[PDB]
Structure 1
Amino acid sequence: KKGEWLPGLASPGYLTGSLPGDNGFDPLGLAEDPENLKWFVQAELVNGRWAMLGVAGMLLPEVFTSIGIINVPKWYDAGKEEYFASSSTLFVIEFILFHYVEIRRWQDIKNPGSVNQDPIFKQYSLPAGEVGYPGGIFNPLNFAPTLEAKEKEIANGRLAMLAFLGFIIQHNVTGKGPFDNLLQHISDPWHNTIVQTL
């Protein structure tokens, strides 16, 4: 039992259950090629991690301000609030920093193990891990990278990506934050749904 996305359907051959979260879901056959699968697994990892962080950032502040602890704006309108630096300055700083770190990650992906070493202090190299899972300084608490935990990470990331899609579509169609939508639906579920929204 590798997990079946359709009980009555067999899983694709190129999927063998080795990868965490492998439930045999790939109707479009996007991973017929081992290299394509190897690239897409990393794509999924990074997309899921970013999605989890983003959905947390959009959700937790909203509920916290709704219950009355902090007074943050909504995620969609948070762009206008003036910060200590100009928006363009922040964007360019972020661009430089990410242009460095993401290229480091890319070099790791292309040929594993070539960028485990600190480029300034010749000591302090990362432990020889696996692509997409660089331990060492990135894992201070040193939680075991057990396979079951990897599956939990993958599942939570997929849920977060679905949630972000919902966040943006709900904001586009309704015009407010997700938590307000949930609260309104809870107030009267039988007259507050997509049908009445549309």
Structure 2
Amino acid sequence: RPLWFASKQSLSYLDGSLPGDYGFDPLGLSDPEGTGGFIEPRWLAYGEVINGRFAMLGAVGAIAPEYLGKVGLIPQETALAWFQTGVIPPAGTYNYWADNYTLFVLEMALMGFAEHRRFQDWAKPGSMGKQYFLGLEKGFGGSGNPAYPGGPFFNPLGFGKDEKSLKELKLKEVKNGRLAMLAILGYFIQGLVTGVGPYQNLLDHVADPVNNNVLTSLKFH
């Protein structure tokens, strides 16, 4: 069992039953002694799961259109960096079929339905397949585990039908999530420092590792 910067506090509760358990908690945040709001070790594992998943989509989709437009068929009108997409209007705003703000209201309504019902599987797991909802209720029952609900919608292919391969895939999801979470954090700081794009910065360092923006530390938009 690999232990990375463990402590007598961390090893007391970090048991190894949680997926990706490397025994790392110098701050003792998953400490089960004084549990209240959001400082619940189950909620913290769910937070890493969801943050890692969304960051996997983020780490891909932020550097995806820039590389795609560099060498690809999708037109160069839509090929920009993630910060020049209209996310940050002062960094560059592209005009879609809506005014950005209406895109936000529409996405808040959609994410509202999805995330509210995802939370109802955390507060009362199983209750999301009881009230009428134009069908769809069966797959919204869950497997009891909030971070791993499964079902016909979210796990139709049945990967890891046994507990062994399920554990291995869970271990893989945890480390992929941590990798992509550090990735989008790197995108944030690189777009803050380099200001040219997540992939344009990588190309500046590939053909020129002597560049080294660390010693540079100058920032422009």
Superposed pair shares fold, TM > 0.5? yes
Aligned residue number for residue 194 of structure 2: 174
Aligned residue number for residue 94 of structure 1: 107
Higher relative contact order (CA 8 A, sep 6+): 1
Pairing of 1:1-40 with structure 2 (within 5 A): 1=1, 3-6=2-5, 11-33=10-32, 36-40=40-44
Q: In the TM superposition, what whole-angstrom CA distance separates every residue of 1:120-164 from its partner, at most 9, and x where no partner exists?
A: 246751364121112121123332261100110110000000011
- Distance between the aligned counterparts of 1:81 and 1:193, measured in 2? 28
Pairing of 1:137-176 with structure 2 (within 5 A): 137-144=153-160, 146-176=166-196
Instruction: Name the SS for the 2:54 alignment partner.
Output: helix
Q: Is the 8 A contact 1:184 1:192 kept in 2?
A: no
Q: In the TM superposition, what whole-angstrom CA distance separates every residue of 1:52-92 from its partner, at most 9, and x where no partner exists?
A: 10111011222121224332122111111111122221111
Q: Would the alpha carbon gap of residues 18 and 153 (structure 1) be closer, same or farther in structure 2, given more than 3 Å must change? A: same
- Distance between the aligned counterparts of 1:89 and 1:51, measured in 2? 24
- Distance between the aligned counterparts of 2:216 and 2:19, measured in 1? 40
Aligned residue number for residue 133 of structure 1: 148
Aligned residue number for residue 78 of structure 1: 85
Q: Which amino acid aligns with 1:140?
A: P
Aligned residue number for residue 60 of structure 2: 56
**Higher alpha-carbon deviation: 42-51 or 28-37:** 28-37
Aligned residue pairs, count: 196
Pairing of 1:180-195 with structure 2 (within 5 A): 180-195=200-215
- Distance between the aligned counterparts of 1:118 and 1:4, measured in 2? 45
Identical counterparts, % of pairs? 44
Q: Would the alpha carbon gap of residues 85 and 78 (structure 1) be closer, same or farther in structure 2, given more than 3 Å must change? A: same
Root-mean-square deviation (CA, aligned residues, Å) is 2.1
- Distance between the aligned counterparts of 2:71 and 2:136, measured in 1? 48
Q: TM-score, normalised by structure 1?
A: 0.89
Q: Would the alpha carbon gap of residues 74 and 118 (structure 1) be closer, same or farther in structure 2, given more than 3 Å must change? A: farther
Gaps of 5+ in 1: none
**Higher alpha-carbon deviation: 110-119 or 88-97:** 110-119
Instruction: Name the SS for the 2:31 alignment partner.
Output: coil
